[PDB]
Amino acid sequence: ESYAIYVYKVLKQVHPDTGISSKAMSIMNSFVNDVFERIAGEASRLAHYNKRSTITSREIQTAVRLLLPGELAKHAVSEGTKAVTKYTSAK
Amino acid sequence: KSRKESYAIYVYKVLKQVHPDTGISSKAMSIMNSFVNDVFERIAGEASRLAHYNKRSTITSREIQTAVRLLLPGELAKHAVSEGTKAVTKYTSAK
Amino acid sequence: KTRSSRAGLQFPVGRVHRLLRKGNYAERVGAGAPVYLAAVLEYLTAEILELAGNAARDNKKTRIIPRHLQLAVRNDEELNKLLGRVTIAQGGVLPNIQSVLLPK
Amino acid sequence: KAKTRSSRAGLQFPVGRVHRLLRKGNYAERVGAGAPVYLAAVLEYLTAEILELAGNAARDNKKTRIIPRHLQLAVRNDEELNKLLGRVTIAQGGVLPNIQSVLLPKK
Amino acid sequence: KPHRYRPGTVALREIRRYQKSTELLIRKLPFQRLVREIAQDFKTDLRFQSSAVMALQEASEAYLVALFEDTNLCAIHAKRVTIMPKDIQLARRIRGERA
Amino acid sequence: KPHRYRPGTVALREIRRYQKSTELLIRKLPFQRLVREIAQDFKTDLRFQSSAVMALQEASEAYLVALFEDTNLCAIHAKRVTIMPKDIQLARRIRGERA
Amino acid sequence: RDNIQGITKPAIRRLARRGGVKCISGLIYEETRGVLKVFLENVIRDAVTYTEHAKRKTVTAMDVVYALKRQGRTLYGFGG
Amino acid sequence: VLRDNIQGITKPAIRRLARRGGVKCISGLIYEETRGVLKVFLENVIRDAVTYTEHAKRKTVTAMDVVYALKRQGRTLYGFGG
DNA sequence: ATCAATATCCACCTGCAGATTCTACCAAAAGTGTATTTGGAAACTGCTCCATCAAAAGGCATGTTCAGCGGAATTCCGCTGAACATGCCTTTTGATGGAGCAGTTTCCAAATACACTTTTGGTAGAATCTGCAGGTGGATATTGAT
DNA sequence: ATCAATATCCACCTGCAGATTCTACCAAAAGTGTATTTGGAAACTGCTCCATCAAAAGGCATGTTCAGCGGAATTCCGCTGAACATGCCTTTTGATGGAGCAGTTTCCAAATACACTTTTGGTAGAATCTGCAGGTGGATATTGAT
């Protein structure tokens, strides 16, 4: 299992004519997983420093803030909220 | 009013088993408590990782042990394992 | 329809959702969670490939290799900080020589 | 006349509590019976290592109640403990007595 | 009448003294003020448990006191006995916080 | 008569070169034996996926290189351009590895 | 007065002393304050973020502790 | 039989690493010091690594063994499956 | 400065290893869809414990003076960098045997999951109790001037 | 060496703040006994990928010569931090309304859970493609001598 096809879609969106060597995709793959565990981790803690049994979108979001630098977070929050709202406003 | 658990009563027990005539300031006790929670967290954390690496569902003494080996300085690790094992062996041989 | 299309995303909402559960981070995972985290995840890979991609371009290259990822990261204050304790194998270092060291 | 696991493992620490926390800790889906016990044994033990050292500390101060300074001196003066707690700060512990020789009066 | 200790003797005396004790060395209220002010840019109308300030203070001094031990080392490496801005700068660089 | 670059011209030339590329710099095989030596006078009858030796090596060079930067910074702090043992040592001291 | 200047020279001097420093360049104090400012800005930001996550208006000892722990400056004596 | 392999870390190799690191001048005494420092770095990464291996009851150190070891040490590697 | 020695740069060229390209299979995913459980937002509340206004306390700001430190200059010389020779050992390309990782079906010690019952650790409130911090005195060691 | 100013240390003292011993009410643990479920050891084994040996060549490590320069030691101003005694402004301490942090209670949206149905993203694998690594020779630096 891996994020490679997904990295690849995204990749084609920013740089339509650019490719990625496996060695890079490999690093890309590592990168995604790392970020994932960090976010998930801060979420884990957050949730239970509050005697909450659930990690919701709200924990992920505080986590994104606790973990990312300034502009990147201003931007992740944005995309994240955007997605949730779109996911919800459907079905 | 929601309780507020802490290891203080055990710390104190262990203390007296070591220095029966010594007492511990309150602020001291609060540190010992933070010490225990930290260690707890650290060992449990490593243990968790260990299980996930090995696609295992259960944290056992095995994990606590490897965890301790990864978390503590040589000798410390050594005793920690010794004690560790004493405890499980004794607990098993008993009705 | 997949939950990603429902969420407007290229990263796998359902896979991330599955991953959160096996990571055992909490007894339960609300549906909002994997959606949001798959966004942030995709958002960040977008940023680093956007920047890697140019490094490859600045080097008369078409295929990104680790060196471009490294260039991308170390040359951006935020990624460089987010990634400050991370080693990107085969990446090299940024060209940089202290002044006192140059000819006189 | 039920007996507690801590008494069975022969320990002062809450073998049951540790077990409780381990489950609530979201660390794993399941928790072996012996981990609670082992881990408890390990906690207790480290506890004993610091109070013993910290206790001496107080003797060496002609004092009988252990305060933070006593735990801080106990720690940073033990290669192993100090390493183990090398990214930890003990409130109210101060720092070990120490002056770079070069800063001393020329005798 | 005339006494006067030579430069360094009282400094030394003070080092011995302070490495003995453990009290905080920054005055509470000004500190409390500084904390409150910094925080006021993060969220407004905040209140702070007395413990949270006390913990923060305790954490900053131990930080600064330690940064002082690496600075002093950096100064001595340059064969000086006087710490300088650059000395602090160099320690924080090697520590991973710097530019 | 024979051409001769002044001491340091080639050195700067090598920094430019090496900093411009990313191949490993420690002989492959030699390093592997060190790995097998350290590992074994640690636990016998062990084996290695070649990638594990390779990860050890990428990790190491990246540590070592990152270490020399700090060392290089330390020497310069001392007004020198030649790194020395105590520089490496001051850097690891400040880095926590010692202290 | 200004609050950061509220951290005085004699206190910075006392700190230094505790860190075993004997001679102190005058340019240190200012340089020091900025380091303390940046220190507290980093911690507080995370403590206050924890605060909000819990919908409160009081930074709690714990919220500072959780913060120091993320910053990697674990503190003992206040729960965390 | 493995012996003195630390001497495989040759001057030239240790000099290139210093170059990548931006260093123009090197004292004769740096090399022995560097091998000293590398040997410790290796032992630290490998003790853990092999501890992961044993755990898992395998005879072969996997790269993940190393990847986990490096992550325990706060020296996270990317590119080998994590 | 003009100038020979050399390293550096950079676009043109091409066999090649590593990337892209279906074709096919499919277990495991992810989705749809009722059915059951429940977590935590949400509102009301009471009681801490926090921000605040006053007053007793005890540092910090301040300006002078000078000692000693840092750094500029200067110099001796020892070690490090450059260039060169020789030739060892790493690197490269294969191929082979087999160890040990990893897939699978199997089956039970150990785990979970109610549910009944005993008890223990935390809070609160009072009353009694004590280690020590600072406060004195007086002896003596340290520092600095002569 | 000699006082003279001071700091430091030590034995003793005592009030008190905080540590201790008491009594006890109790929901949340923690232990017990039953019933059900299942994680992951053990036994057989397909199969990958690790250790190994094999041979050749050339990229490198090694070892030397040699002289340039950078590090270390020494001298020496002059400026800048340390000591100090000076004047009083802020910090600290302490008594107090009220704003929340918490304890409880309610119920509806949202999360499990198990059942099917379906779509996908790994992958074994032969086939086809393509960026560029590595070679080249000729145009522009860049160095170092004079």
The Cα of A38 is separated from the nearest Cα of chain G by a number of Å equal to 11
DSSP state of C90: T
Task: Give Cβ neighbours of residue H12 (< 8 Å, ≥ 6 apart).
Answer: none
Give burial (CB, 10 Å; 0-12/13-18/19+) of E29.
Answer: exposed
Q: Are B83 and D45 in contact (CB under 8 A)?
A: yes
**Is H8 at the interface with chain F, CB within 8 A?**
yes
Q: What radius of gyration do chain E's Cα atoms show?
A: 18
Beta bridge partners of D30: B58
Task: Give Cβ neighbours of residue H14 (< 8 Å, ≥ 6 apart).
Answer: H30, H31, H34, H35
CA distances from D73 to B28, B43, B55, E56, H6 (A): 13, 24, 42, 22, 38
**Pairing state between β D65-66 and B23-24:** parallel
Sequence spans of domains, chain F: 1-99
Evaluate if the CB of A41 falls below 7 Å from strand J: no
Superfamily of D1-107 according to CATH: Histone, subunit A (1.10.20.10)
**Pairing state between β C28-29 and A54-55:** parallel
The C-alpha atoms of residue B30 and residue D86 are separated, in whole angstroms, by 19
Q: Which domain holds residue G38?
A: 1-80
- Report the first-to-last Cα separation within chain F, whole angstroms: 52
**Is A20 at the interface with chain C, CB within 8 A?**
yes
Q: Are D29 and B75 in contact (CB under 8 A)?
A: no
For A1-91, the fitting CATH number among 1.10.20.10, 3.30.1330.10, 1.10.3720.10, 1.20.1090.10 is 1.10.20.10
The C-alpha atoms of residue D55 and residue D80 are separated, in whole angstroms, by 17
> Which pairs from G48-51 meet CB under 8 Å and 24+ separation?
G48/E39, G48/E42, G48/E43, G48/E46, G49/A62, G49/A65, G49/A66, G49/E42, G50/A46, G50/A49, G50/A62, G50/A66, G51/E43, G51/E46
Sequence spans of domains, chain D: 1-107
**Method by which the model was determined:** X-ray
- Do F and E count as touching (3 or more CB pairs closer than 8 A)? yes
For B1-95, the fitting CATH number among 3.40.50.150, 3.40.190.10, 3.40.50.300, 1.10.20.10 is 1.10.20.10
Evaluate if the CB of F21 falls below 7 Å from strand J: no
Phi then psi for E59, rounded to 5 degrees? -75, -35
Resolution expressed in Å: 2.9
Question: Which positions 10-29 of G are in contact with E (Cβ < 8 Å)?
Answer: 11-12, 14-25, 27-28
CA E12, E18, E20: angle at the middle one, nearest 5?
A: 110
Closest CA to C30 of C43, C42, C13, C10: C13
**Helical pair H30-55 and F50-77, crossing angle rounded to 10 deg:** 140
Residue E55 one-letter amino acid = A
Q: Which of residues 8-67 of C touch strand I (CB under 7 A)?
A: 12-15, 17-18, 28, 60, 63
Sequence spans of domains, chain A: 1-91
The C-alpha atoms of residue D91 and residue G77 are separated, in whole angstroms, by 6
State the Cα torsion C64-C70-C72-C75 to the nearest 10°.
Answer: -150
Q: Which CATH architecture has domain C1-104?
A: Orthogonal Bundle (1.10)
The C-alpha atoms of residue B40 and residue D36 are separated, in whole angstroms, by 11
The C-alpha atoms of residue C7 and residue C11 are separated, in whole angstroms, by 10
**Helical pair F50-77 and H63-72, crossing angle rounded to 10 deg:** 30
Name the residue facing C90 among H22, H70, H79 (closest C-beta): H79
CA distances from G38 to E21, E63, E94, G31 (A): 27, 12, 17, 11
Q: Closest protein residue to I40 using CA and C1' atoms? A: A52
What is the maximum span of chain D, computed from C-alpha positions, in angstroms?
A: 72
Give burial (CB, 10 Å; 0-12/13-18/19+) of B37.
Answer: middle
Q: Where are the alpha helices (DSSP H) in B1-95?
A: 8-18, 26-53, 61-71, 74-92
Superfamily of E1-99 according to CATH: Histone, subunit A (1.10.20.10)
The C-alpha atoms of residue D45 and residue B13 are separated, in whole angstroms, by 12
Nearest CA in chain B to D29: B57
- Report the first-to-last Cα separation within chain H, whole angstroms: 33
For the four alpha carbons of C39, C45, C48 and C51, in that order, the dihedral sign comes to: negative
H, E, C per residue of H5-56: HHHHCCHHHHHHHHHHCCCCEECCCHHHHHHHHHHHHHHHHHHHHHHHHHHC
Cβ contacts (< 8 Å) between B43 and chain D: which residues?
A: 39, 42
Cβ contacts (< 8 Å) between A37 and chain H: which residues?
A: none
Quote the tokens at residue A90: 């459907």
Task: Give Cβ neighbours of residue E50 (< 8 Å, ≥ 6 apart).
Answer: none
Q: Are G77 and B38 in contact (CB under 8 A)?
A: no
